């Protein structure tokens, strides 16, 4: 969201006659598509993490079942790490405390 607000901040200064309008339209179009795609993936990725963390409450009290749930939660966090969504350490810590509870 920081980048898109920067690109939109760039566009407020331009006028329709600017020769920079050619590269700018492609940049704004491309970045906002990237913003939408990443957000859509995050809504799916966190739903998976939310379903798993609620699964810990109502799973059989055996170590392997508990490990399997956290293994699936760990893989989802690893994909978030690859995409580079910011503030991931702060967010996971909140997820860690709710898992700890």
């Amino acid at each position: 969201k920081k980048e898109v607000q920067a690109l939109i901040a760039e566009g407020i200064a331009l006028v329709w006659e600017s020769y920079k309008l050619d590269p700018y339209v492609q940049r704004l179009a491309e970045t906002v598509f990237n913003f939408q795609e990443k957000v859509d993936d995050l809504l799916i990725i966190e739903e998976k993490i939310d379903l798993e963390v609620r699964s810990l409450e109502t799973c059989m009290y055996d170590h392997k079942t508990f490990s399997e749930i956290l293994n699936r939660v760990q893989k989802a966090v690893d994909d978030l790490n690859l995409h580079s969504y910011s503030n991931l350490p702060i967010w996971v810590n909140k997820l860690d405390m709710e898992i700890e509870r």
Partner: protein, 247 residues
């Protein structure tokens, strides 16, 4: 067989101590306090922490004052009668002294400092100090013999060793301020009365300081800001060449 009770380091489980020592089992119990020599800087802080915890535990027991004074008299009689409840301080990972020489530039003065501190604490609580190394298997048999002697009343014959840095052993009653004064002779920068923390420093471990939370501006404030924007629209070389110019 001697009951062994190891309490977890967090105070949250200190209330478990009521299931380790009771009024009937208090005199039979021997108290062991661990001191980590891989982390020497916290040793006295940990020792006053755990000793104070033990004092608080004995407070909740509500022993009769006559019985408590009887126990004190028995312990002190065992104390002064020494010739060449119980509390024993055991130092673990003393081999980490070898690390302290290479990583923190320690020397014999610092080791004299910490062991003089430990012997003064043992005098304060009337305890026996011993140095051990499970990695090097140092003083384990000496430990076992002293434990059996102080619990079952078995004999003991090993003398006090206070010359070696990482193998010090001091049975109860041996230590005294006059005897502790020998280490103060080795001091050349510090004094016995100097604070522990100022001389021996707790290292500032470089923990990963999580970065500041970068937050996107809200859409309303961002658009208000954009509306506001829219509406208002080398030396050392010179030193050398001066040096070769003056002459």
């Amino acid at each position: 067989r001697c009951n062994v009770w190891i309490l977890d380091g967090d105070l949250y489980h200190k209330g478990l101590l009521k299931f380790a020592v009771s009024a009937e089992s208090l005199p039979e119990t021997l108290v062991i306090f661990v001191a980590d020599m891989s982390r020497p800087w916290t040793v006295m802080e940990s020792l006053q922490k755990w000793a104070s915890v033990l004092r608080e535990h004995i407070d909740k027991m509500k022993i009769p004052p006559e019985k408590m004074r009887e126990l004190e008299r028995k312990f002190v009689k065992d104390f002064q009668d020494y010739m060449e409840i119980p509390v024993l301080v055991v130092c673990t990972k003393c081999d980490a002294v070898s690390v302290l020489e290479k990583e923190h530039d320690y020397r014999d003065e610092h080791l004299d400092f910490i062991q003089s501190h430990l012997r003064r604490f043992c005098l304060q609580y009337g305890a026996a100090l011993i140095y051990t190394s499970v990695k090097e298997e140092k003083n384990l048999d000496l430990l076992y013999k002293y434990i059996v002697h102080k619990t079952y009343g078995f004999h003991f014959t090993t003398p006090a060793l206070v010359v070696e840095k990482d193998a010090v052993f001091i049975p109860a009653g041996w230590d005294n301020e006059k005897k502790i004064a020998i280490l103060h002779e080795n001091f050349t920068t510090v004094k016995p009365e100097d604070a522990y923390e100022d001389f021996i420093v707790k290292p500032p471990v470089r923990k990963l300081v999580h970065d500041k939370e970068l937050a996107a501006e809200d859409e309303q404030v961002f658009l208000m800001k954009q509306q506001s924007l829219l509406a208002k629209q080398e030396g050392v070389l010179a030193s050398f060449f001066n040096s070769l110019l003056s002459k």
